[PDB]
Design an enzyme around this catalytic site. Structure first.
Site, mmCIF file in Angstrom:
data_model
loop_
_atom_site.group_PDB
_atom_site.id
_atom_site.type_symbol
_atom_site.label_atom_id
_atom_site.label_comp_id
_atom_site.label_asym_id
_atom_site.label_seq_id
_atom_site.Cartn_x
_atom_site.Cartn_y
_atom_site.Cartn_z
ATOM 1 N N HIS A 88 32.016 76.991 -22.783
ATOM 2 C CA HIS A 88 32.886 78.149 -22.710
ATOM 3 C C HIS A 88 32.426 79.207 -23.739
ATOM 4 N N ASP A 141 33.137 66.376 -19.648
ATOM 5 C CA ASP A 141 33.782 67.606 -19.252
ATOM 6 C C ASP A 141 32.742 68.731 -19.141
ATOM 7 N N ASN A 170 45.306 73.691 -14.636
ATOM 8 C CA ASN A 170 45.307 73.370 -16.091
ATOM 9 C C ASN A 170 46.608 73.895 -16.668
ATOM 10 N N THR A 187 39.742 71.099 -15.378
ATOM 11 C CA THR A 187 39.695 69.807 -16.017
ATOM 12 C C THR A 187 40.775 68.836 -15.509
ATOM 13 N N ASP A 208 50.416 71.061 5.595
ATOM 14 C CA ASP A 208 50.252 69.821 4.822
ATOM 15 C C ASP A 208 48.930 69.155 5.146
ATOM 16 N N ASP A 235 33.631 66.338 -14.346
ATOM 17 C CA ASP A 235 34.781 66.867 -13.657
ATOM 18 C C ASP A 235 34.526 68.198 -12.939
ATOM 19 N N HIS A 236 33.608 69.037 -13.430
ATOM 20 C CA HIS A 236 33.303 70.362 -12.938
ATOM 21 C C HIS A 236 32.086 70.861 -13.691
ATOM 22 N N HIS A 253 35.111 78.200 -15.666
ATOM 23 C CA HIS A 253 35.043 77.393 -14.450
ATOM 24 C C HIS A 253 36.398 77.494 -13.792
HETATM 25 C C1 LIG Z 1 46.171 62.607 1.117
HETATM 26 O O1 LIG Z 1 46.634 61.309 0.749
HETATM 27 C C2 LIG Z 1 48.051 61.235 0.507
HETATM 28 C C3 LIG Z 1 48.316 59.786 0.185
HETATM 29 O O2 LIG Z 1 48.254 58.957 1.348
HETATM 30 C C4 LIG Z 1 48.865 61.766 1.688
HETATM 31 O O3 LIG Z 1 50.187 61.965 1.146
HETATM 32 C C5 LIG Z 1 51.197 61.227 1.776
HETATM 33 O O4 LIG Z 1 51.629 61.822 2.986
HETATM 34 C C6 LIG Z 1 52.749 61.137 3.624
HETATM 35 C C7 LIG Z 1 53.238 62.010 4.829
HETATM 36 O O5 LIG Z 1 53.433 63.453 4.443
HETATM 37 C C8 LIG Z 1 53.896 60.935 2.622
HETATM 38 O O6 LIG Z 1 54.851 60.059 3.220
HETATM 39 C C9 LIG Z 1 56.205 60.543 2.909
HETATM 40 O O7 LIG Z 1 56.647 59.790 1.754
HETATM 41 C C10 LIG Z 1 58.046 59.967 1.404
HETATM 42 C C11 LIG Z 1 58.258 59.181 0.141
HETATM 43 O O8 LIG Z 1 57.689 59.935 -0.943
HETATM 44 C C12 LIG Z 1 57.876 59.277 -2.219
HETATM 45 O O9 LIG Z 1 57.338 57.934 -2.305
HETATM 46 C C13 LIG Z 1 55.845 57.819 -2.268
HETATM 47 C C14 LIG Z 1 55.499 56.349 -2.504
HETATM 48 O O10 LIG Z 1 55.457 55.999 -3.934
HETATM 49 C C15 LIG Z 1 55.060 54.617 -4.223
HETATM 50 O O11 LIG Z 1 53.808 54.237 -3.644
HETATM 51 C C16 LIG Z 1 53.683 52.773 -3.432
HETATM 52 C C17 LIG Z 1 53.702 52.528 -1.920
HETATM 53 O O12 LIG Z 1 52.615 53.214 -1.195
HETATM 54 C C18 LIG Z 1 54.802 51.979 -4.219
HETATM 55 O O13 LIG Z 1 54.490 50.575 -4.283
HETATM 56 C C19 LIG Z 1 54.995 52.540 -5.647
HETATM 57 O O14 LIG Z 1 56.226 52.007 -6.153
HETATM 58 C C20 LIG Z 1 54.918 54.115 -5.672
HETATM 59 O O15 LIG Z 1 55.831 54.783 -6.539
HETATM 60 C C21 LIG Z 1 55.208 58.779 -3.329
HETATM 61 O O16 LIG Z 1 53.796 58.733 -3.321
HETATM 62 C C22 LIG Z 1 55.682 60.207 -3.110
HETATM 63 O O17 LIG Z 1 55.050 61.077 -4.064
HETATM 64 C C23 LIG Z 1 55.180 62.517 -3.816
HETATM 65 O O18 LIG Z 1 56.385 63.136 -4.352
HETATM 66 C C24 LIG Z 1 56.494 63.419 -5.820
HETATM 67 C C25 LIG Z 1 57.327 64.694 -5.914
HETATM 68 O O19 LIG Z 1 58.703 64.444 -5.817
HETATM 69 C C26 LIG Z 1 55.156 63.636 -6.613
HETATM 70 O O20 LIG Z 1 55.218 62.959 -7.875
HETATM 71 C C27 LIG Z 1 53.871 63.160 -5.916
HETATM 72 O O21 LIG Z 1 52.786 63.981 -6.418
HETATM 73 C C28 LIG Z 1 53.973 63.269 -4.379
HETATM 74 O O22 LIG Z 1 54.095 64.658 -4.089
HETATM 75 C C29 LIG Z 1 53.311 65.010 -2.974
HETATM 76 O O23 LIG Z 1 53.853 64.440 -1.740
HETATM 77 C C30 LIG Z 1 55.171 64.990 -1.334
HETATM 78 C C31 LIG Z 1 55.614 64.255 -0.049
HETATM 79 O O24 LIG Z 1 55.920 62.832 -0.267
HETATM 80 C C32 LIG Z 1 55.027 66.534 -1.149
HETATM 81 O O25 LIG Z 1 56.274 67.107 -0.739
HETATM 82 C C33 LIG Z 1 54.531 67.179 -2.447
HETATM 83 O O26 LIG Z 1 54.260 68.592 -2.336
HETATM 84 C C34 LIG Z 1 53.240 66.527 -2.906
HETATM 85 O O27 LIG Z 1 52.231 66.870 -1.973
HETATM 86 C C35 LIG Z 1 57.229 60.232 -3.237
HETATM 87 O O28 LIG Z 1 57.613 59.871 -4.568
HETATM 88 C C36 LIG Z 1 58.921 59.500 2.581
HETATM 89 O O29 LIG Z 1 60.300 59.560 2.179
HETATM 90 C C37 LIG Z 1 58.607 60.385 3.799
HETATM 91 O O30 LIG Z 1 59.450 60.013 4.902
HETATM 92 C C38 LIG Z 1 60.164 61.067 5.623
HETATM 93 O O31 LIG Z 1 59.320 61.647 6.640
HETATM 94 C C39 LIG Z 1 58.875 60.649 7.627
HETATM 95 C C40 LIG Z 1 58.035 61.376 8.637
HETATM 96 O O32 LIG Z 1 58.213 60.718 9.886
HETATM 97 C C41 LIG Z 1 60.090 59.908 8.300
HETATM 98 O O33 LIG Z 1 59.668 58.874 9.219
HETATM 99 C C42 LIG Z 1 60.971 59.299 7.224
HETATM 100 O O34 LIG Z 1 62.045 58.584 7.830
HETATM 101 C C43 LIG Z 1 61.427 60.418 6.261
HETATM 102 O O35 LIG Z 1 62.292 61.394 6.877
HETATM 103 C C44 LIG Z 1 63.579 61.474 6.160
HETATM 104 O O36 LIG Z 1 63.504 62.212 4.919
HETATM 105 C C45 LIG Z 1 63.046 63.586 5.084
HETATM 106 C C46 LIG Z 1 62.919 64.191 3.700
HETATM 107 O O37 LIG Z 1 61.561 64.182 3.301
HETATM 108 C C47 LIG Z 1 64.028 64.343 5.986
HETATM 109 O O38 LIG Z 1 63.477 65.633 6.246
HETATM 110 C C48 LIG Z 1 64.309 63.591 7.298
HETATM 111 O O39 LIG Z 1 65.273 64.350 8.057
HETATM 112 C C49 LIG Z 1 64.697 62.089 6.996
HETATM 113 O O40 LIG Z 1 65.915 61.785 6.298
HETATM 114 C C50 LIG Z 1 57.070 60.293 4.132
HETATM 115 O O41 LIG Z 1 56.632 59.030 4.614
HETATM 116 C C51 LIG Z 1 53.471 60.380 1.257
HETATM 117 O O42 LIG Z 1 54.504 60.541 0.269
HETATM 118 C C52 LIG Z 1 52.302 61.178 0.713
HETATM 119 N N1 LIG Z 1 51.865 60.661 -0.572
HETATM 120 C C53 LIG Z 1 51.451 61.370 -1.625
HETATM 121 C C54 LIG Z 1 51.053 60.579 -2.841
HETATM 122 O O43 LIG Z 1 51.390 62.605 -1.624
HETATM 123 C C55 LIG Z 1 48.335 63.085 2.263
HETATM 124 O O44 LIG Z 1 49.020 63.444 3.476
HETATM 125 C C56 LIG Z 1 46.819 63.133 2.389
HETATM 126 N N2 LIG Z 1 46.304 64.444 2.725
HETATM 127 C C57 LIG Z 1 45.619 64.740 3.821
HETATM 128 C C58 LIG Z 1 45.287 66.192 4.057
HETATM 129 O O45 LIG Z 1 45.228 63.800 4.555
HETATM 130 CA CA LIG Z 2 51.378 69.732 9.532
HETATM 131 CL CL LIG Z 3 45.067 76.672 -13.573
HETATM 132 ZN ZN LIG Z 4 36.594 74.112 -19.595
#
Ligand SMILES: *[C@@H]1O[C@H](CO)[C@@H](O[C@@H]2O[C@H](CO)[C@@H](O[C@@H]3O[C@H](CO[C@H]4O[C@H](CO[C@H]5O[C@H](CO)[C@@H](O)[C@H](O)[C@@H]5O)[C@@H](O)[C@H](O[C@H]5O[C@H](CO)[C@@H](O)[C@H](O)[C@@H]5O[C@H]5O[C@H](CO)[C@@H](O)[C@H](O)[C@@H]5O)[C@@H]4O)[C@@H](O)[C@H](O[C@H]4O[C@H](CO)[C@@H](O)[C@H](O)[C@@H]4O[C@H]4O[C@H](CO)[C@@H](O)[C@H](O)[C@@H]4O)[C@@H]3O)[C@H](O)[C@H]2NC(C)=O)[C@H](O)[C@H]1NC(C)=O
Ligand SMILES: [Ca+2]
Ligand SMILES: [Cl-]
Ligand SMILES: [Zn+2]
Ligand SMILES: CC(=O)N1CCN(c2ccc3nc(C)n(CC(=O)NCc4ccc(Cl)c(Cl)c4)c(=O)c3c2)CC1
Ligand SMILES: [K+]
EC number: 3.1.4.39
Length: 805
Positions: free
Chosen positions: A265, A121, A180, A159, A687, A308-309, A420
């Site tokens: 720190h 750290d 944090n 961190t 996004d 980490d930083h 940091h």
């Molecule tokens: C950096 O990398 C990451 C990782 O690749 C990129 O992030 C990904 O971006 C994708 C597109 O934006 C996004 O796809 C979403 O996913 C929705 C499902 O989300 C849940 O399930 C995820 C999978 O979990 C499991 O993973 C493996 C399989 O891979 C399994 O085997 C395991 O069992 C795992 O559990 C999961 O990761 C995701 O986690 C997020 O949500 C939680 C909060 O509730 C948090 O704990 C966690 O931190 C994540 O939070 C982040 O992501 C969410 C968005 O998911 C965001 O809002 C938060 O702020 C935060 O950033 C979930 O638990 C899926 O339902 C989506 O589908 C809708 O949209 C598509 C678009 O076309 C449609 O086709 C689809 O039909 C559907 O539309 C329908 O539903 C809509 C409602 O949303 C509705 O409006 C519409 O009208 C329809 O009914 C979509 O595919 C990935 O989830 C996301 N992953 C992560 C980890 O963030 C990222 O983009 C990269 N960054 C850059 C800059 O490149």
């Molecule tokens: Ca966008």
């Molecule tokens: Cl913070």
């Molecule tokens: Zn510190």
């Protein structure tokens, strides 16, 4: 409730955590206050300390002892780490010459080289140099293995966001650990470094390495450590796990040190008090390597030493107080420190006005040591917006400073000289990476890279398939002797149209005018050739970009530039052009000031129109290929095509005109030619990913012409600047930006001055990786080069930071 009258006998540092109400014996039971009554007596022994001495050699085993010098200790796996040195004539690992590890040299039963991640750290990158005399074990790992000069953390440079990034390969906005401390408005709960709320799994998203491992049948040690377990015991525990039977033994392990952060720190990053914490970390490394060498695992395990930083000098007196700017300071909640995050004090209060808050915090004092931002306006490189735990208002704090809400917060909430959390391009926030072992290269320096890339590598080191993440898999292949991942280019999804002349002028009613009717077999064959792509090898130096989604677009060739013109968004996705060192800048002639010309290759129905710009009193237009850099008065007419026009706020036009008229030519001068690819970006939902046409929130008034959120440029040349950009035989050099397309220059406090005093500073702040632009555009660049794909992946992850050495 815990029924803590069960027992840890035979269970010390067990790997599987048991479920309430039964008491626990794993390396986290202390955090949870749920250890069995006999955990300390059995599992945290201390008698006789951590080192064998001559008089203990071949002693009779005493089970009370912290570690053992008895003859049976290697077979049991619980010798003190220095046992072989004191009792068997062996040398400390650090005292051995380094010898190339060409192949894993592992005991029988080891199916793969284990991975040990040693996380420190607040280990600032420059400690490698400045502390070198007191860290011999770390200096040996560094010089014998693979190292970078520094590793870039994520923002915020705190961190928990960074350690969890290390474990997931995700940005904090994606994994959910965005600080944090954090407030989640849906949970209506706060997470903090201290306390129990951070135990709840609902905060922690993505798929960390230990889960990825476990899902694919690779067993993983704990990555968290209770703070009361001393380091010596953490090391002996890892070494004991490594002695387990094959079917029980983890393949990945994590050690964590709270130092040197804890002391940094208190004393600042280079306080005289910092030498001893560096010494003690080094000693720990030597305990580990000596332990490994005893178990004949020192040429078998892959070790990663990572921080980490970093740490910066920060004191109470360098605090900006919001109470000096706002009248209504009791209506806000601030997350304070080396960043600021502001939300309304009372949730669902309808009168709290973010715009009035921002305005009251903008350019109010000449020396002001923070800048406020709506989170969607933060530099895209920080990837710090797409999470409901990130407040709409963000303050980016200058290095060496703090922000706080009111003075009482600081004199009743100076006990500290280091901190940091600042912008992750800040030199003081950079941290370390060393990889040592059979799978890493020998005696190899690698360029600086981002910590988001390590998850992919750790997966590779363990034979795992990585979960989807923000790394670019293949960009760090150059760290490894043996790669199990072979990157390939994504397939092009949309192929372009190559339209020829298909429309007469009179078919257009775009409300555009130009003074262009001043009109030879020589220079009519030649201009036809140019429209067919004869100069394209000059202006498209790395192939055309691939479009990785389904759309309709045209390739348009010109004397001085090529473009990929979208019939959906009515503007180019990309415009590519080379400017030699010798190129000349020219003006827009008076008679062409407001010239816009129909493009006879492109239907009226898929064109923009000048009338929309005339009616839209907020929106003007600019050009992606700059008329200023026309090769000839005649070629300059091509720059006024309607297919080269983009919507631009007048405020943004000041930035873009300076870039195009002054800066491009300067870079061509300094870099011996440049290739420029410029284009729009639409990211209205912040996004970091290209918007679909149905996500666009703003159009040029009365039209279907979508307004970009940002404009990008990628500026490539030859790394060997003795060769011109257009005749480069070797590796490339790139800098890129993603400028926010804003209707004011409020971000730039000096904007009322000539653009030569502020535009370039703005562009530097918004520096970007090519990979960042790729995500935001759905384009893939550098498709045709003579370079290896892995090398091009590293190029695409490069960030030009503009920091000093
Ligand atoms: C950096 O990398 C990451 C990782 O690749 C990129 O992030 C990904 O971006 C994708 C597109 O934006 C996004 O796809 C979403 O996913 C929705 C499902 O989300 C849940 O399930 C995820 C999978 O979990 C499991 O993973 C493996 C399989 O891979 C399994 O085997 C395991 O069992 C795992 O559990 C999961 O990761 C995701 O986690 C997020 O949500 C939680 C909060 O509730 C948090 O704990 C966690 O931190 C994540 O939070 C982040 O992501 C969410 C968005 O998911 C965001 O809002 C938060 O702020 C935060 O950033 C979930 O638990 C899926 O339902 C989506 O589908 C809708 O949209 C598509 C678009 O076309 C449609 O086709 C689809 O039909 C559907 O539309 C329908 O539903 C809509 C409602 O949303 C509705 O409006 C519409 O009208 C329809 O009914 C979509 O595919 C990935 O989830 C996301 N992953 C992560 C980890 O963030 C990222 O983009 C990269 N960054 C850059 C800059 O490149
Ligand atoms: Ca966008
Ligand atoms: Cl913070
Ligand atoms: Zn510190
Ligand atoms: C997601 C998950 O499985 N759970 C279950 C475990 N729970 C948890 C439980 C006890 C804890 N006790 C302590 C002392 N600490 C401090 C600590 O260990 N710091 C070192 C460290 C190493 C690796 C990482 Cl990735 C991070 Cl972020 C921090 C924790 O963070 C901590 C966390 C978190 C959510
Ligand atoms: K206008």
């Amino acid at each position: 409730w815990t029924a803590t009258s069960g027992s840890c006998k035979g269970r010390c540092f067990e790997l599987q955590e048991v479920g309430p109400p039964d008491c626990r014996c794993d390396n986290l039971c202390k955090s949870y206050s749920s250890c069995c009554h006999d955990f300390d007596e059995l599992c945290l022994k201390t008698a006789r300390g951590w080192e064998c001495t001559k008089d203990r050699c071949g002693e009779v085993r005493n089970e009370e002892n912290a570690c053992h010098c008895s003859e049976d200790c290697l077979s049991r796996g619980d010798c003190c780490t220095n046992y072989q040195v004191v009792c068997k004539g062996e040398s400390h690992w650090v005292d051995d010459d380094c010898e190339e590890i060409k192949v894993p040299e592992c005991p029988a039963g080891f199916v793969r080289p284990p991975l040990i991640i040693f996380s420190v750290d607040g280990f600032r990158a420059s400690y490698m140099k400045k502390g070198s005399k007191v860290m011999p074990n770390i200096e040996k790992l560094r010089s014998c293995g693979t190292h970078a000069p520094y590793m870039r953390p994520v923002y915020p440079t705190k961190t928990f966001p960074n350690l969890y990034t290390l474990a997931t390969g995700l940005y904090p906005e994606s994994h959910g650990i965005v600080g944090n401390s954090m407030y989640d408005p849906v949970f209506d709960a706060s997470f903090h470094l201290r306390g129990r709320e951070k135990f709840n799994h609902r905060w922690w998203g993505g798929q960390p390495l230990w889960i990825t491992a476990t899902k694919q049948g690779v067993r993983a040690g704990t990555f968290f450590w209770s703070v009361s377990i001393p380091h010596e015991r953490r090391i002996l525990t890892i070494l004991q796990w490594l002695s387990l039977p094959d079917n029980e033994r983890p393949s990945v392990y994590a050690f964590y040190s709270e130092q040197p952060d804890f002391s940094g720190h208190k004393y600042g990053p280079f306080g005289p008090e910092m030498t001893n914490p560096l010494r003690e970390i080094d000693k720990t490394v030597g305990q580990l390597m000596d332990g490994l060498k005893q178990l004949r695992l020192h040429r078998c395990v892959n070790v990663i030493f990572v921080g980490d930083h970093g740490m910066e000098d920060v004191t109470c007196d360098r605090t900006e107080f919001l109470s000096n700017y706002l009248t209504n300071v009791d209506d806000i909640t601030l997350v304070p420190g080396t960043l600021g995050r502001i939300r309304a004090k009372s949730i669902n209060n309808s009168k709290y006005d973010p715009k009035t808050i921002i305005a009251a915090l903008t350019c109010k004092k000449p020396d002001q040591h923070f800048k406020p931002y709506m989170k969607q306006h933060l530099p895209k490189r920080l990837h710090y917006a797409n999470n409901r735990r990130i407040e709409d208002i963000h303050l980016l704090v200058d290095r060496r400073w703090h922000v706080a809400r009111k003075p009482l917060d600081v004199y009743k909430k100076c006990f500290f000289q280091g901190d940091h959390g600042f912008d992750n391009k800040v030199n003081s926030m950079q941290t370390v990476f060393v990889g040592y072992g059979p799978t890493f290269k020998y005696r190899t320096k690698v360029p600086p890279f981002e910590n988001i890339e390590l998850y992919n590598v750790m997966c590779d080191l363990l034979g795992l398939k990585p979960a989807p993440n923000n790394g670019t898999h293949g960009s760090l292949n150059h760290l490894l002797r043996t790669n199990t991942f072979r990157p390939t280019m994504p397939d092009e999804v949309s192929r372009p149209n190559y339209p020829g002349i298909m429309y007469l002028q009179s078919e257009f009613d775009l409300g555009c005018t130009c003074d262009d009717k001043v009109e030879n077999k020589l220079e009519e064959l030649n201009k036809r050739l140019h429209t067919k792509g004869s100069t394209k090898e000059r202006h498209l130096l790395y192939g055309r970009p691939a479009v990785l989604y389904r759309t309709s677009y045209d390739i348009l060739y010109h004397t001085d530039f090529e473009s990929g013109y979208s019939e959906i968004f009515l503007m180019p996705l990309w415009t590519s052009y080379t400017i030699s060192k010798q190129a000349e800048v020219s003006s827009i002639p008076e008679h062409l000031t407001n010239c816009v010309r129909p493009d006879v290759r492109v239907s009226p129905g898929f064109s923009q129109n000048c009338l929309a710009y005339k009616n839209d009193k907020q929106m003007s237009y600019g050009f992606l290929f700059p008329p200023y850099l026309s090769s000839s008065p005649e070629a300059k007419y091509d720059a006024f095509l309607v297919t080269n026009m983009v919507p631009m706020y007048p405020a943004f036009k000041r930035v873009w005109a300076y870039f195009q008229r002054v800066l491009v030519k300067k870079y061509a001068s300094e870099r011996n030619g440049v290739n420029v690819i410029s284009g729009p970006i639409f990211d209205y939902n912040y996004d970091g990913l290209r918007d679909t046409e149905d996500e666009i929130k703003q159009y040029v008034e009365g039209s279907s012409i979508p307004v970009p959120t940002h404009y990008y440029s990628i500026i490539t040349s030859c790394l060997d600047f003795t060769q011109p950009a257009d005749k480069c035989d070797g590796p490339l050099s790139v800098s890129s930006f993603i400028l926010p397309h804003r209707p004011d220059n409020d971000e730039s406090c000096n904007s009322s001055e000539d653009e030569s005093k502020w535009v370039e500073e703005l562009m530097k702040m918004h520096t970007a990786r090519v990979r960042d632009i790729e995500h935001l555009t759905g384009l893939d660049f550098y498709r045709k080069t003579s370079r290896s794909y892995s090398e091009i992946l590293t190029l695409k992850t490069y960030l030009h930071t503009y920091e000093s050495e």
